């Protein structure tokens, strides 16, 4: 019932799914429809980088980006790298600043060290193993931070992997969902300065940020990502629930109250006693 609120949303089109450890608990809209993911691309690339670490292709401490920066800094947005270009604006690990280019350097490292084109690496390491046959990233590492395309059905499967890790070990997933470089403050695009602005290994961590895109009832351990294309994904380890929402309207003030509302509606209705 909670997902029905989508029919009243001021968007050209939308689709959503509630996922639990046993599978999809509810859906709405066309789950087969392809949507631009924008930054919802990051969790996919992050998982691919996590698989690469486990394959031994790279290590979390492997140098990548500005001097003193590593794969871990790139994943957690602490490389000191600028938002859009190879401009070093801070010393690695001192500041937390969301960066698209940070993910391109990340994709470039995995690509170089593995010998596989990143888009293809993503497919073979994440999408193919989970059956995500309508998910793709074209554009190479330059678009590693926002160029992925997918469907609610494919993301639903992905959310399953985030709830019960299979593509990576339970230890890597625990690590990826733990705050990396804690204590760092910063702005969460669209939600202003956050103290602190916690981030995991490629996955944003809610903590107690406010205002935020998740619900007021999501636990502080909730992690995921939203995108400027008007889509998002969060996984709440405490509620053991996941929510995927994709719309055809770019992020804006219209979503500021709706996103949190559907999140709390979903938690209240599907959270097991």
Q: Record the tokens describing residue 200, joined without a space.
A: 């995991």
Report whether 89 contacts 101 (CB < 8 A).
Answer: no
How far is Cα 174 from Cα 272, in angstroms, rounded to an integer? 22
Classify strands 186-187 and 204-205 as parallel, antiparallel or unpaired: unpaired
Distance (Å, whole) CA 42 – CA 143: 10
In sequence order, the 6+-apart residues with CB closer than 8 A to the CB of 16 are 3, 6, 27, 28, 29, 152, 243, 244, 245, 246, 262
Distance CA 273, CA 263 (A): 17
Instruction: Determine the 3-state secondary structure of 17 from DSSP.
Output: strand
Q: Rounded to 5 degrees, what angle do the CA atoms 62, 63, 65 make? A: 135
Phi, psi of 258 (to 5 degrees): -65, -45
Are 215 and 263 in contact by the 8 Å Cβ rule? The answer is: yes
Structure-token match 């019960």, residue found: 164
Cα–Cα distance, 248 to 36 (Å, whole number): 8
- Given a contact cutoff of 8 angstroms between Cβ atoms, the answer to whether 245 and 232 are in contact is yes
Q: Which helix (H) or strand (E) holds 28?
A: strand 23-28
Quote the CA–CA distance of 4 and 16 in Å, as a whole number.
Answer: 9
Please report where in the chains the tokens 């193993």 appear, as a residue.
Answer: 129
Angle formed at CA 200 by CA 260 and CA 237, multiple of 5 degrees: 55
Q: Name the DSSP class of 10.
A: S
- Return d(Cα 232, Cα 247) in angstroms, integer: 9
Longest dimension (CA), the chain: 51
Q: Closest Cα partner for 156 from 231, 262, 252?
A: 231
- What residues contact residue 39 under an 8 Å CB cut-off, 6+ apart? 145, 146, 225, 226, 227, 228
**In terms of Cα–Cα distance, which of 252, 208, 260, 242 is closest to 11?**
252
**Determination method here?**
X-ray
Strand-pairing partners, residue 193, are: 187
3 state DSSP class of 156: helix
- Integer angstrom CA distances of residue 224 from 112, 177, 233: 27, 9, 5
Instruction: Give the CA distances from residue 3 to residues 233, 246, 259, 263, in Å, rounded to whole numbers and listed in that order.
Output: 14, 12, 11, 9
Q: Cα dist. 56→49, 51, 52, 114, 231 in Å?
A: 11, 9, 6, 9, 32
In angstroms and rounded to an integer, the radius of gyration of the C-alpha atoms of the chain is 17
> SS3 string of 51-117?
HHHHHCCCCCCCECCCCCCEHHHHHCCCCCECCCCCCECCCCCCCCCCCHHHHHHHHHHHHHHHCCC
φ and ψ of 236, to 5 deg: -110, 105
CA–CA gap between residue 256 and residue 186 (Å, rounded) = 19
- Resolution of this entry, Å: 2.2
Task: Count the helix, strand and coil residues of the chain and give each as a percent rounded to the nearest 5.
Answer: 35, 20, 45
Strand positions, DSSP E, 112-203: 136-137, 148-150, 186-187, 193-194
225 secondary structure, DSSP code: E
What angle, rounded to 10 degrees, do the helices at 100-114 and 41-55 form? Answer: 30
Domains of the chain: 1-273 (3.40.710.10)
Token look-up 């502080």 returns 220
3-state secondary structure of 119: helix
């Amino acid at each position: 019932t909670a997902l029905e609120v989508l029919g009243g949303w001021p968007v050209p089109a939308a689709a959503a799914a509630v996922i639990g450890p046993a599978g999809v608990l509810a859906t709405h809209g066309d789950t087969a429809r392809v949507f631009a993911l924008a930054s919802v691309t990051k969790p996919l690339v992050a998982r691919a980088a996590q698989v690469a670490v486990e394959e031994g292709v790279v290590n979390l401490d492997t140098p990548a980006g500005p001097p003193g920066s590593t794969v871990r800094h790139l994943l957690a947005h602490t490389s000191g790298l600028a938002m859009h270009s190879d401009q070093a604006l801070a010393r690695p690990g001192t500041r937390r600043m969301y960066s698209n280019y940070g993910f391109t350097v990340l994709a470039e490292s995995v690509q170089r060290e593995s010998g596989i084109e990143f888009g293809r690496y993503l497919t073979e390491a994440v999408c193919e193993p989970l059956g995500m046959v309508t998910t793709r990233l074209d554009g190479g590492p330059a678009a590693a931070g926002f160029g992925a395309t997918s469907t609610v059905a494919d993301l639903a499967v992905f959310a399953g992997d985030l709830l019960r890790p299979s593509t990576v070990s339970a230890q890597m997933h625990a690590d990826a969902t733990t705050v990396q470089f804690p204590g760092l403050d910063g702005v969460l695009p669209g939600y202003g300065v956050q103290r602190p602005n916690d981030w995991g290994l490629g996955f944003e961590i809610r903590n107690s940020k406010s205002p935020h895109w998740t619900g007021e009832c999501n636990s502080t351990r909730t992690f995921g990502h939203f995108g400027q294309s008007g889509g998002f994904i969060w996984v709440d380890p405490k509620a053991d629930l996941a929510l995927v929402v994709l719309t055809a309207r770019d992020f804006g003030d219209w979503a500021l109250d709706l996103w949190p509302a559907i999140s709390d509606a979903v938690l209240a209705e599907y959270t097991l006693e």
